């Protein structure tokens, strides 16, 4: 429900300055009315008898009026631009605040360029509001002042313009929808181009490492050709529209010339009155001509509002703020959890029931295919269970604040993408204002202190884009530190040790007893050596907890799946 009805309250809020702008526009129209009166007086009274004193006073008055009109027009433009920039700032802030709150399901179905294009075309509304379009509209709608005077001059050439105006309206109505559609197509092409460019620049490593320069170049060539063709169609339609406007204006001017000549020859008007009438008619048609060269801007702004609504009309993660849910101690329960990726996909988790208490270092094992890779995204509210409900501390997560929940749990993944900052900034990303003492402590805990130190910049090294400057294990040890800086009540290891050599995994398992001090730790790994020292071990097969218990109680049964997996691993 994001429309120009959103712009209405913003207009009402600055109604006072907008009324000031309306008054200034009326007075500008008054000055523009005064000037042709001076031309008519000069033509009809200074040249007929004689004139050297009336001419001089008219000249000085005209100079003063011109200077004042220029200053007033500049002030009006400045005030209007200020007032509209305030509104566009409001709109941009609201748009980004809404964008950051959308669920990851929204982002997984789109491309980065697709959703960057709308935030970028916010600049279209930004340019329109701080432009000459609305000032020209105000000038056009305040043109009855000139009609009231030309009716006094002549009640026939006035109806000429009064009947010309509906021709302008009809031409505008006829030519609007076609260029609206063409600009819609052009925006679609632009979004595709932006998505392709963003994806190509992001993945330049794969493009260059492989041999696919020609394929990317061919795709770019086709996309650019299509985009330029659409732009040319838009340009052609705009040119046709403005040429039609010119045709209407000039045929009206010719008819007025004929009628005014016959009127003057017959004595019901004078030469000076005819000249003044021509100037007034030109002054009325000037805003229409000025508004016909920014037609693409009007239609593009309509499309801009439509696309910003497309982004802004999506449902967000429901913020449930009341009673101020307190800090949690680790207590995770799964109650008949049934989960599938897509409603047209096989069920992953059938009937998982689970209970994790405080201080319990839980280990979850299985083969590729089980549902152990989705629990880390179920504890976080990234996956919505189809059936059942997940509870932390007895409170259901379906009615809990996502920001409050995700600030308590620290999840270390296998990829662990980083941001384009320094080592200390990335490690302290969850809280940029943190002292070096905690950074050092976390780096020592994760075992990354040494490598960071051996560097030349130390903890100030820029990792590049997505941490490209660091290896797979270095990013892993930076992610572990980043998860450990701000004390998480629940810490999850989702196959975070498989991307490391022996002499780093051993360090992590040796520091684990300090890592899990007063914490609830869940460890998920393909291997079984990582979880051999956990409080409980849980085996999952095709999304079903088959058996659970201690390591010895699991290995004691030769018929168990865990014994088979241990034999295969060894």
């Amino acid at each position: 429900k994001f429309d120009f009805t959103w712009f209405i309250p913003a207009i009402i809020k600055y109604r006072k300055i907008f009324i000031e702008t309306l008054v200034v526009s009326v007075f500008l129209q008054l000055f523009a009315l005064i000037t042709p009166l001076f031309f008519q007086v000069v033509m009809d009274k200074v040249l007929v008898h004689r004139g050297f004193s009336t001419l001089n006073v008219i000249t000085v008055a005209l100079s003063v009026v011109v200077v004042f009109e220029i200053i007033l027009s500049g002030l009006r433009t400045y005030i209007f631009a200020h007032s509209t920039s305030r509104i566009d700032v409001e709109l941009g802030a609201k748009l980004f605040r809404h964008l950051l709150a959308l669920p990851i399901s929204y982002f997984e179905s789109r491309r980065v360029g697709d959703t960057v294009a709308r935030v970028r075309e916010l600049d279209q509304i930004r340019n329109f509001l701080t432009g000459q379009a609305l000032t020209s509209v105000l000038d056009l709608l305040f043109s009855f002042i000139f009609f009231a005077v030309m009716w006094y001059y002549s009640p026939k050439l006035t109806l000429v313009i009064l009947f010309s105006l509906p021709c302008y309206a009809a031409w505008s109505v006829f030519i609007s929808p076609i260029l609206r559609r063409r600009l819609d197509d052009k925006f679609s092409r632009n979004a595709d181009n932006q998505s392709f460019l963003v994806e190509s620049v992001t993945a330049i490593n794969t493009i260059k490492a492989m041999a696919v320069s020609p394929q990317m170049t061919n795709i770019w060539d086709k996309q650019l050709a299509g985009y330029v063709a659409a732009g040319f169609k838009v340009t052609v339609l705009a040119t046709i529209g403005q040429q039609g406007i010119q045709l209407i204006q000039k045929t009206v001017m010719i008819i007025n010339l004929w009628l005014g000549a016959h009127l003057v020859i017959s004595g019901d008007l004078s030469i000076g009155q005819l000249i003044a009438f021509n100037m007034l008619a030109g002054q009325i048609v000037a805003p229409v001509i000025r508004l016909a060269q920014i037609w693409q801007d009007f239609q593009q702004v309509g499309i801009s509002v439509t696309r910003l609504g497309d982004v802004l009309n999506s449902p967000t993660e429901s913020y449930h703020g009341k009673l101020a849910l307190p800090e949690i101690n680790g207590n995770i329960t799964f109650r008949n959890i049934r989960f599938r990726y897509k409603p047209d996909s096989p069920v992953i988790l059938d009937n998982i029931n689970l209970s994790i208490k405080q201080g319990e270092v839980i280990g979850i094992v299985g083969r590729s295919g089980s549902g152990k890779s989705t629990l880390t995204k179920l504890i976080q509210r990234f996956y919505i269970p189809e059936n059942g409900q997940v509870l932390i501390d007895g409170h259901d997560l379906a009615l809990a604040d996502p920001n409050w929940l995700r600030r308590q749990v620290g999840v270390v993944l296998q990829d662990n993408v980083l941001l384009n900052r320094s080592i200390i900034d990335n490690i302290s990303l969850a809280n940029p204002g943190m002292s070096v003492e905690k950074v050092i402590y976390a780096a020592k805990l994760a075992g990354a202190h040494d490598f960071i130190s051996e560097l030349r910049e130390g903890y100030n090294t820029i990792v590049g884009e997505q941490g490209a400057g660091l290896s797979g294990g270095q990013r892993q040890r930076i992610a572990i530190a980043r998860a450990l800086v701000n004390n998480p009540k629940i810490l999850i290891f989702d196959e975070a040790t498989s991307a490391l050599d022996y002499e780093s995994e051993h360090i992590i398992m040796r520091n684990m007893h300090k890592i899990c001090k007063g914490r609830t730790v869940i460890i998920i790994a393909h291997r079984l050596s990582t979880v051999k020292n956990a409080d409980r071990i849980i085996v999952m097969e095709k999304g079903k907890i088959v058996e659970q218990g201690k390591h010895k109680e699991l290995l004691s049964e030769p018929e168990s799946l865990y014994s088979y997996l241990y034999q295969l691993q060894s």
Partner: protein, 165 residues
Amino acid sequence: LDTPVREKDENEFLPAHLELIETPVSRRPRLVAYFIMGFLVIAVILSVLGQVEDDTLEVTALVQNKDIGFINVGQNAIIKVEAFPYTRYGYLVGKVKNINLDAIEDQKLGLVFNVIVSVEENDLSTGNKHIPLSSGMAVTAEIKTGMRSVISYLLSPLEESVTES
């Protein structure tokens, strides 16, 4: 107009095709010349089809004898008094009486046969009210008697200049 971008339009802008086309041409390779020729032809046709023209006052004055001969008694020749401007005073009417055989004076030229013209007594209304016409005056009485196809404006200077040897 309301046609989406087809495939031919995309091929027209394909960089691979533009690289192979050296010394390219415009889409309408020969429309501007056609329109210029059409405008010139229309102007020429319009040129050869367009035709462009105290009480007992007298406008007897210098003028071509053939011009007076083309005019007839009672021709519409208006009179403009100098007392005031043409717009303010108005263009009154002075019926042209037959031009006398004898010229009024030979100072201006030979063709000074004094085409006398008298007002109609119904042209000067209350607005003018210039009853004191001051008969010793030469109010300009425009006498229009004939029209020449505009193209005759080209016929006059060039052809006469060619005539002299």
